Amino acid sequence: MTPHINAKIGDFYPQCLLCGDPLRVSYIAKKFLQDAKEITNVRNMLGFSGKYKGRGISLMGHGMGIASCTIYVTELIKTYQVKELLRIGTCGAISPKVGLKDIIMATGASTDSKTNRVRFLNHDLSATPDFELSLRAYQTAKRLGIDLKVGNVFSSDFFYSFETHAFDLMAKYNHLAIEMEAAGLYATAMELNAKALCLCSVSDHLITKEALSPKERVESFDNMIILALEMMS
Template sequence: MNYTDNGRNFFTETPHIKPKGAEIAETILLPGDPLRAQFIAETYLEDVVEFNRVRGMLGYTGTYNGNRISVMGTGMGIPSMSLYSWELIHVFGVKNLIRIGSAGAIQDKLNLYDIVFAIGASTDSNYAKQYHLPGYYSITASFDLLEKAKQTADRQGQAVHIGNVLSSDIFYNEDSTALNKWSEMGILCAEMETAGLYMNAARAGVNALSILTISDHIFREEATTPEERQTSFTQMMEIALELA
């Protein structure tokens, strides 16, 4: 039997998310790494309840500054992000989805640990084909979340870059010139999830935003460690948590 509150379904489960009655909040943070989700829950949230661990994709709900908020890993790539975000939206009633992830810089003005707000997401993915659109779709963030995130960053004294990012299906690209071409079009950085999240959110009429931390600079061969990516991208996390 399902329990609903204002149309939101708390006891429903999917093959990938099994809350067992635990709440999933209307606002959720979505790191790719489930261990980053665990770090956020343990470091920032109060009254934490685990709502998922299927396939190791850890999910938690708690309170931050008196507001209910959830956090869950999504894995790598548009297919994984799209699967989890679709279920969170359509099955569990999530309204605000904030990706907090890492990205590789492809512009000289970006440095390690810089923060990027993705106002748009260019992509080499064919994910939009399912919509049978009679042209090319411009993939953009929700302005309400983007505006609130910028105001939060300003209050916290955090400098951010706002612009277009690349969501690529390809990590090891046979075309060694591909990122140079995207860079020439003003793309700030490359990652693998934002375009799928934004399309799912737009189609469902909910809000989405990607907040990214530069984990490596592709052209300068600079990089952070996996451990640093898991636990030290706290500026990005603290901006996102204020969006609940």
């Protein structure tokens, strides 16, 4: 039905959680969802539909980077009629305004990719999330006690940056972290009239050069998972 998803039309609820790591998508199915079944497995990129607090929710892995994210976000919308996409993952903080275990809501995704220039007349597409969904995130966060960090992230084509000298200038311009997908997520949801949001969990801080132990990563990520599931229920 698509080259990258072997689910049947209707297997996806119109709300979908997105992760890069299909192993994390699997974890969220067995632990936080009821009646969760695997609906897709192409290239080991798992996807699930299930229930949280009585409500129907779908989960989907999307690999790493803007190209990979765009492929799956594209197919989820145009073929499986997903209408809200919430992506959650890790980043590398580059700003002193955030530290470990913080959660970042990206209201802007700057980039060094050419994808949005290709999409958009070789001008500067300000790749942003759906406002209402970010309002749900902010409000849900408050009810759950989370102090959300709000600002821009920088979506890079490079995990190994050739421009680490530019991180202070990115922080200057209200870039709280670097990750690798939100500009594609946001541009794709924009392209296809869909609602998207990206939440970051600070697992590594690239300025102070501190990181979380593998235990704290699981507990830090659990709190971002609950936030996601709570704003979609």
